[PDB]
Amino acid sequence: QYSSNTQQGRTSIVHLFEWRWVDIALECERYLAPKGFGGVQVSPPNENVAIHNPFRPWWERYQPVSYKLCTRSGNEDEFRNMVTRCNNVGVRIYVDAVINHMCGNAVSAGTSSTCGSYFNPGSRDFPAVPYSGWDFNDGKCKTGSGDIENYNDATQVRDCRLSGLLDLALGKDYVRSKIAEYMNHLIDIGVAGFRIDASKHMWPGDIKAILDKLHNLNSNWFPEGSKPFIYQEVIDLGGEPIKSSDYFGNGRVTEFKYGAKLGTVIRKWNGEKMSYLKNWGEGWGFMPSDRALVFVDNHDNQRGHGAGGASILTFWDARLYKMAVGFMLAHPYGFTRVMSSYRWPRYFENGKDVNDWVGPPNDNGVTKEVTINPDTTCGNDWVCEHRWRQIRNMVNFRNVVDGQPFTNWYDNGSNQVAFGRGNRGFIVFNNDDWTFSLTLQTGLPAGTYCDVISGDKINGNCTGIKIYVSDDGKAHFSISNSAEDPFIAIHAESKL
Amino acid sequence: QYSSNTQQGRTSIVHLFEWRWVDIALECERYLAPKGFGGVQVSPPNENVAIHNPFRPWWERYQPVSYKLCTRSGNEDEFRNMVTRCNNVGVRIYVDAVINHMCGNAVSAGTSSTCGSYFNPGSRDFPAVPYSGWDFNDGKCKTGSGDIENYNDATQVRDCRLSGLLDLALGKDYVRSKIAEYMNHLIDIGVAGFRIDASKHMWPGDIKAILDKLHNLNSNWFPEGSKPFIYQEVIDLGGEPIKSSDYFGNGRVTEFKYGAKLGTVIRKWNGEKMSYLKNWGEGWGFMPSDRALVFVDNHDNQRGHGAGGASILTFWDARLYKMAVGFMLAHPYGFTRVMSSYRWPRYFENGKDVNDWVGPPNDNGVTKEVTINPDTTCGNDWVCEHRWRQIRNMVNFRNVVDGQPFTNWYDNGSNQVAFGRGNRGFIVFNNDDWTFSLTLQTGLPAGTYCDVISGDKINGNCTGIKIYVSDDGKAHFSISNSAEDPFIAIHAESKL
Ligand SMILES: [Ca+2]
Ligand SMILES: [Ca+2]
Ligand SMILES: [Cl-]
Ligand SMILES: [Cl-]
């Protein structure tokens, strides 16, 4: 469950948040694959509730109605097509498994669901699964409201409803089998792994129990004995009885400390600065590197009230986003995931985004297709950070320097750093307010390297900055505190 | 060190942030004392640096220059006068001890100091103490910058400089004696205890070592064997090697989880709601009640980037501030402290308050006196939350119900709660968006009680809401979701 199952060098997976299958299919073939991306974190592919108030939320997909692969992204047919096509290009698909609950109990009974299955939350009836009264933890939960009231009572966290969300009774085999059936169905199609949603609200043991019921990856794209890659969403920044570690037995864990801290350091808040990043990794109190799944921002927290808080850097602050993402990708710690969002009428009001609920760009609740522009950017309001050059090349930079150790770190006791990955890469940062000039030991073979940030190496030449390295490995760098991008990166493949 | 040393029933101490001695003297006599306040947390009474950039900060008082009781609040003469006068009315004085460091090392040498003592930070010379090179942890600190670089290395946290702040060598006896001398000087004047600043950056043992060198409270106002009340500033919300508990041996600890969480619950963020507050206290993972020192907001975090984050409620959001403060005071857990701030040109910019550095209201760096208006409010820009009726009476409510157990808790599985303190008090809350009507068991003797929130009991009558309780203890309540104050509180002394 620890192996990504990616294909050939590929070190990172992108989350094409709320995208439609037909669009990820294409995206895979036309970009993802040729641009070295490992895989795609898809949105909950199961039939969910249709929330009309507010209008079609970004979170209605985390409120299950059945396990029919039939969401706003498409139907099973379209879904299979995507996996098949993406797999044919070495781009893995990772399904967002929503398995601790169904929809909110308050929700009105009816057919208001992405696939039209009937369902009555008040009576606990989900005929399309099927689930019923005794398949939910109603009895088991010890709280007065039946809701999670105190995150200090590890037990009520897993046995009670998260925000009123009907908590499936995962202790029962009927339920574990129904879920395993769902996840196995996916696997048979060609899935490479999952993102176990709300892992904190599930007993590690239950998650294991369920995982153990899984088949092996489809012999048609994976080797014999391939195990579904498993990363579980657990938000643990201390202060709670439940610890990320509690889940290492099932697979990787989402390290939310990573993105939080990094952002705090890039934003230069709380006296933090980049020179303090010498021992970035387990050194800053982060879960063991090969049990971690990192990212700067994830779909949820990029909206402000996630784990990190206002400190989380998102696409909105591009100049600093690109940097934090660049640093992350360049550093060896954890397994990386890059975000790819969509734009929305962000309107802050005393502390909150009154619109952080807004769903994907659409036309009367119908998700807009992702259109590509001659300059490789997207249309219809899809941000497409994964297509940005500064990130894209760094997504590749990671690939190129894979396996190489962290070294040749330099700092100016401020915000001007730089470090390399063995002899295949080097990256230099300047988050200070004064031009950065100095000759650094790049630990790279002599030659002329193209900065894959300001440009690329095309037809034997750089389109951006050129860096000159000499036998002794040294090279001079110059990054103005107001440069387009205050950081430069070079690697074995960007050498002329 | 655990006993507050307060006087007769008095359960809470107010922090008259940045106030001048002459003003606290008066305040004590004219208000504090008659209104049942226990004590006052004064600002660092020692000579500090004079920061002209930005102009006279709220934090220059946490950057020591000598131990001369001579700050912007006044001179020793004025200081003694305050203590003497306040003590004469049963109002204790608690000094903010700034003892882990002096000023920042970067600071220019000179006499730019509240009392004019000379001092050279670069050479480590504080002739007015006196301290010198070997009296600071310069050697001891293992980091490269000499600054605290990783809060995951408990040891460098106490041996290295906090934000460049020269870290006093508290391992040495010369230093412990110099500090003890300072704290003992204070005690001889009439101090009741302290607030040990930056306790996290000091070894529990050092703090004990220093405390042990202290005399006993002045026999002129305290009983024989009175021990200085000790509450240490330690910000611990988990995730770190250093734990609040690590200091229980010295005295109480600032529980920052309290204010954070409560605010999150009142703001109705992260699915939180008041009905979940059944077992508020150690039940929510908080440090042992009689080792805790609670508050909603403290001088630091009320500015946003403190422990709690944007979740911390301050005077700015009065409607919700009053409630959180009311709940806190009404609930038995921990020893309470109420904040009293001053207004400032708050200007937010992408995440931060570009003015959270602004000092107290003034006239060319001279602190403005605190003026009182006919309606009991303050002038010259001093907020004076401690004078607000909703708080003031609750500060007394605590006194009245002292010793009584938590009971008769009620919730509507939402935000409409209520609970009582034995048979001397009852409080009802409505933080829901719909009028609150219901007959609750107040566990109070039958009679007609005045709501000490909407009004008072004066000359045998209520000036605000009247609550009618019958023998059976029941009483009806009605709080509109848009009432002036969405919570009502009654107690033994507000009965006609
Ligand atoms: Ca659960
Ligand atoms: Ca220290
Ligand atoms: Cl996630
Ligand atoms: Cl404090």
Task: Tell me the count of A-B CB pairs closer than 8 A.
Answer: 78
Q: What angle do CA B462, B467, B468 make, to 5 degrees?
A: 120
Query: What residue has token string 């493949």?
Result: A493
Q: Identify the CATH class of B2-403.
A: alpha beta
Distance B120 CA to ligand 2 centre (A): 20
- Structural element, H or E, at residue A490: strand A487-491
- Restricting to A residues 142-161, those with a Cβ less than 8 Å away from any Cβ of B are 144-145, 147-152
| CB atoms A309 and B305 under 8 Å | no
Cα Rg of chain A, angstroms:
23
Cα separation, B424 vs A223, in Å, equals 73
DSSP-derived secondary structure for A177-190: HHHHHHHHHHHHHT
Q: Are A204 and A159 spatial neighbours (Cβ–Cβ below 8 Å)? A: no
* Residue A387, phi then psi, degrees to nearest 5: -100, -15
Written as six digits, the tokens of B432 are: 């829901």
Breaks in chain B at C–N > 2.5 Å: after which residues? Answer: none
Q: Are B42 and B95 spatial neighbours (Cβ–Cβ below 8 Å)? A: yes
Query: What residue has token string 């950057």?
Result: B63
Q: Are A289 and A332 spatial neighbours (Cβ–Cβ below 8 Å)? A: yes
Distance A43 CA to ligand 3 centre (A): 11
Cα separation, B423 vs B429, in Å, equals 18
Written as six digits, the tokens of B389 are: 């009726």
- The residue count for chain A: 496
Q: Is B376 left (phi over 0), alpha (psi -120 to 50) or beta?
A: left
Report which of A145, A147, A107 is spatially closest to residue A123, judged by C-alpha positions: A107
- Resolution in Å equals 3.0
Q: How many CB atoms lie within 10 A of CB A220?
A: 9
DSSP-derived secondary structure for B251-312: SEEE-HHHHHHHHHHHTT-TT--GGGGTT-SGGGT---GGGEEE-S--TTGGGTTSSSGGG-
Provide, as residue numbers in chain B, all residues whose Cβ is less than 8 Å from the Cβ of A413: 144-145
In chain B, CATH 3.20.20.80 sits at 2-403
Cα separation, A50 vs B118, in Å, equals 71
In chain B, CATH 2.60.40.1180 sits at 404-496
Collapsing DSSP to helix, strand or coil, B382 comes out as: strand
* Residue B38, phi then psi, degrees to nearest 5: -80, -55
B411 CB within 8 Å of a chain A CB: yes
Distance B437 CA to ligand 4 centre (A): 38
Q: Are A346 and A3 spatial neighbours (Cβ–Cβ below 8 Å)? A: no
Report which of B229, B26, B286 is spatially closest to residue A152, judged by C-alpha positions: B286
Residue A88 CB contacts under 8 Å (≥ 6 apart), including other chains: A29
* Homologous superfamily (CATH) for A404-496: Golgi alpha-mannosidase II (2.60.40.1180)
Q: Are B121 and B127 spatial neighbours (Cβ–Cβ below 8 Å)? A: no
- Structural element, H or E, at residue A467: strand A466-469
DSSP-derived secondary structure for A338-351: EEE-B-----EETT
B425-429 and B418-421 as β-strands: parallel, antiparallel, unpaired?
antiparallel
Collapsing DSSP to helix, strand or coil, A13 comes out as: strand
Cα separation, B495 vs B466, in Å, equals 10
B252-254 and B292-294 as β-strands: parallel, antiparallel, unpaired?
parallel
Using CA atoms, how far residue A154 sits from A141, A206, A236, B275, B283, in Å, is: 12, 14, 13, 18, 12
DSSP-derived secondary structure for B9-35: T--EEEEETT--HHHHHHHIIIIITTT
> How buried is residue B294: exposed, middle or buried, by Cβ count under 10 Å (0-12/13-18/19+)?
buried
Query: What residue has token string 């790819």?
Result: A340
Q: How many CB atoms lie within 10 A of CB B350?
A: 10
Q: Are A188 and A218 spatial neighbours (Cβ–Cβ below 8 Å)? A: yes
Q: How many CB atoms lie within 10 A of CB A387?
A: 21
A233 is catalytic: yes
